[PDB]
C-alpha cells in the first residue's frame, strides 16, 4: 500500500511544482530580452508579460496592446489562465480529499485527473493565444520597441513543464487506478 | 549546405514543440478511456493513421479521428511549404 500512496503524494507534489510554474508564468521576471542599437540609438529591452522593463533600468507597465480583436484574445487568454488555476486547485483539493481517505475515491481521483487534463489543454491553448498576441504585436511594430531577439522567456518553458507534470500526475494516479 | 537545420526550415521549432505537447495531450485521453499502457497505444496511434481497437465509438476513438484529420493537415501544410 506504500507504493500507491507514495506515487500519489508524488503526483500531488508534481502538481504543486506545476502550480509553482503556473505562478512563474504569471510571475515572469521579464517575458523576453530585447535590443535596439542603431545610432543616436542604443537600447536593451527586457519586456515582461505585463511589466515591460528596459535597460539605466526602466520597468514599464505597457499591458494590453495590439488593437483590434487581440485585446479580446488577451481576455480569453487571462480567463483561460484563471480557469487553469482553478482546475489546478480543484486537483489539489480532490487529491487532498483522497488524502482524507488516506488518513468512490478512485472515481474521484479520476475526476480530478480529468480536471488536470482540461487544465493542461486549456492552458496550452492559452499559451498559444498569448504567443499569438506577442507575435502579432511584434508584427505591428510595437510603437518603437521591435527587438531583434525576443527569442524566448524561460518561465514559459516552465509553464510547459507544469503541463507535462500535470500530465505525468494524471497518468500515474490513473496507473494506481489501474490496480 | 545546412546540417539538420535545412530539414527543419519549413516549420518553426516552436510549432514542433506545440505538435509534440499536443500529441501528448492526445495520448493521455486514450488511457482516460481505460501511466504507460494506452500511452504506449497512442505511440501505436501516431505511428499509423490514428488509434485502433476501440469497440465502436467508445470515447477516444473520435479523438483518433480528429487526430488523423490533424496530422493529415499538418503534414500537408508541411509538404506544401517545402515545395
Amino acid at each position: 500500500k506504500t507504493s500507491r500512496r507514495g506515487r500519489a503524494l508524488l503526483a500531488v507534489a508534481l502538481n504543486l511544482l506545476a502550480l509553482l510554474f503556473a505562478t512563474t508564468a504569471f510571475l515572469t521576471t521579464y517575458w523576453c530580452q530585447g535590443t535596439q542599437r542603431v545610432p543616436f540609438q542604443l537600447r536593451r529591452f527586457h519586456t515582461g508579460i505585463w511589466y515591460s522593463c528596459e535597460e539605466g533600468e526602466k520597468c514599464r507597465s505597457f499591458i494590453d496592446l495590439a488593437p483590434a480583436s487581440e485585446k479580446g484574445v488577451l481576455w480569453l487568454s487571462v480567463v483561460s489562465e484563471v480557469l487553469y488555476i482553478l482546475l489546478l486547485v480543484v486537483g489539489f483539493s480532490l487529491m487532498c480529499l483522497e488524502l482524507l481517505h488516506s488518513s468512490d475515491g478512485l472515481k474521484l481521483n479520476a475526476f480530478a485527473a480529468v480536471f488536470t487534463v482540461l487544465s493542461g489543454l486549456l492552458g496550452m491553448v492559452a499559451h498559444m493565444m498569448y504567443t499569438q498576441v506577442f507575435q502579432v504585436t511584434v508584427s505591428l511594430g510595437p510603437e518603437d520597441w521591435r527587438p531583434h531577439s525576443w527569442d524566448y522567456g524561460w518561465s514559459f518553458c516552465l509553464a510547459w513543464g507544469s503541463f507535462t507534470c500535470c500530465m505525468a500526475a494524471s497518468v500515474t494516479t490513473l496507473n494506481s487506478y489501474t490496480k | 549546405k545546412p546540417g539538420v537545420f535545412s530539414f527543419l526550415d519549413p516549420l518553426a521549432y516552436e510549432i514542433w514543440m506545440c505538435i509534440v505537447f499536443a500529441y501528448i495531450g492526445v495520448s493521455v485521453v486514450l488511457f482516460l478511456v481505460s501511466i504507460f499502457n494506452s500511452l504506449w497505444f497512442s505511440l501505436g496511434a501516431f505511428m499509423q493513421q490514428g488509434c485502433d481497437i476501440s469497440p465502436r465509438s467508445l470515447s477516444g476513438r473520435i479523438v483518433g479521428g480528429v487526430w488523423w484529420f490533424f496530422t493529415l493537415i499538418i503534414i500537408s501544410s508541411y509538404t506544401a511549404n517545402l515545395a
Binding site: 472515481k107 480529468v114 487534463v117 482540461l118 489543454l121 486549456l122 496550452m124 491553448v125 498559444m128 504567443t131 499569438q132 507575435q135 | 518553426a12 516552436e14 510549432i15 506545440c18 499536443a22 495531450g25 492526445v26 485521453v29 482516460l32 478511456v33 470515447s59 477516444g60 473520435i62 479523438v63 480528429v66 487526430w67 490533424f70 493537415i73 499538418i74 501544410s77
Partner: peptide
C-alpha cells in the same frame, strides 16, 4: 504558427468534447 494554431484549437475542442462523452458514459453506469 497561427494558421495551424486554429487546428490546435479544433483539436483541443475535440478533446474536451470526447472527455465529456466519456463523462456521460460514466454517468450511465
Amino acid at each position: 504558427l497561427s494558421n495551424v494554431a486554429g487546428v490546435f484549437y479544433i483539436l483541443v475542442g475535440g478533446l474536451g468534447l470526447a472527455m465529456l462523452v466519456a463523462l456521460i458514459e460514466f454517468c450511465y453506469k
